[PDB]
Amino acid sequence: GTILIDLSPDDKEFQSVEEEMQSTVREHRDGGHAGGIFNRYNILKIQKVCNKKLWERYTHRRKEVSEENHNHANERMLFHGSPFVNAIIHKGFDERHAYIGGMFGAGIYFAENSSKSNQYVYGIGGGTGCPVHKDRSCYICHRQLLFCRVTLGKSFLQFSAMKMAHSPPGHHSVTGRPSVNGLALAEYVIYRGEQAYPEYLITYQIMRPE
Ligand SMILES: Oc1nc(-c2ccccn2)nc2c1CSCC2
Ligand SMILES: [Zn+2]
C-alpha cells in the first residue's frame, strides 16, 4: 500500500520540513547520553509517505475528533523516533509502537522538538546505540525519524506523570507541558493509532560539533 516519494532539496516542502527538524533542536540535560552530542543534523533524505488506506483511516478519525471538539481537530506536525519506523510507514501506528513506561502510560509519544525524538531512534534511553558500532552518539550511521500529522483534538494537559490507558473522558490526547521540576520540553500522547499519519520519513545524521 505504501509508496515513498523522494523530495528534492530545492522543493519548498523539503525546506520547511528540514527547517523544523533543524530549528526545533535543543540541548538535552542528559549531556547527549541518549541521543548523542550535537547542535544540528546532516539531512540526507526526506521522503513523503503515501498510503491511501492509512490516510483515509487517519482522515476518518480526524473527522470524528473534530466533530467532538467544536469542529477543531487540533492537528499538528510532530516528530516521532523509534526502532519501528519501518513497520510504522507500511502498516501504521499500532500497539507495538506504544511507549509502555511513558509518564502518561502506554500510548504513542510525539515531540515538537526533533532532538527529543532523536533520543528514541535506537530505543528507549537510546538503547545500545547504532547496530553497527553500538554508539548512541554515532555520527557515521544514518538515522531515520518521522515527522507526523497528529490529531490532538481536546488535549488533556499535565505537568507531572499520570499513567492512563486512554485519553480522559471528552479528551483525545494528553500534552505534557514543561515545568520547573518537571519536563524540560513538551510531549504529546495519543492512545489510538489512527490519530497519527507518518507523513515524512527523514534520513539524517547527527553532526559532530566544532
Ligand atoms: O519520539 C518518541 N518516541 C518514543 C518512543 C518510545 C518507545 C518506543 C518508540 N518510541 N518516546 C518518546 C518520543 C518523543 S516524546 C518523549 C517520548
Ligand atoms: Zn554507528
Curated annotation (Swiss-Prot):
Subcellular location: Cytoplasm; Golgi apparatus membrane; Nucleus; Chromosome, Telomere
Post-translational modification: Ubiquitinated at 'Lys-48' and 'Lys-63' by RNF146 when auto-poly-ADP-ribosylated; this leads to degradation. Deubiquitinated by USP25; leading to stabilization.
Tissue expression summary: Highly expressed in placenta, skeletal muscle, liver, brain, kidney, heart, thymus, spinal cord, lung, peripheral blood leukocytes, pancreas, lymph nodes, spleen, prostate, testis, ovary, small intestine, colon, mammary gland, breast and breast carcinoma, and in common-type meningioma. Highly expressed in fetal liver, heart and brain.
Ranges of residues in domain PARP catalytic: 8-210
Chain sites annotated for binding Zn(2+): 130, 133, 138, 141
Taxonomy, superkingdom: Eukaryota
Similarity remark: Belongs to the ARTD/PARP family.
Description of how the protein assembles with itself and partners: Oligomerizes and associates with TNKS. Interacts with the cytoplasmic domain of LNPEP/Otase in SLC2A4/GLUT4-vesicles. Binds to the N-terminus of Grb14 and TRF1 with its ankyrin repeat region. Interacts with HIF1AN. Interacts with RNF146; this interaction leads to ubiquitination and proteasomal degradation. Interacts with NUMA1.
Role according to the record: Poly-ADP-ribosyltransferase involved in various processes such as Wnt signaling pathway, telomere length and vesicle trafficking. Acts as an activator of the Wnt signaling pathway by mediating poly-ADP-ribosylation of AXIN1 and AXIN2, 2 key components of the beta-catenin destruction complex: poly-ADP-ribosylated target proteins are recognized by RNF146, which mediates their ubiquitination and subsequent degradation. Also mediates poly-ADP-ribosylation of BLZF1 and CASC3, followed by recruitment of RNF146 and subsequent ubiquitination.
Protein name: Poly [ADP-ribose] polymerase tankyrase-2
Source organism (scientific name): Homo sapiens (Human)
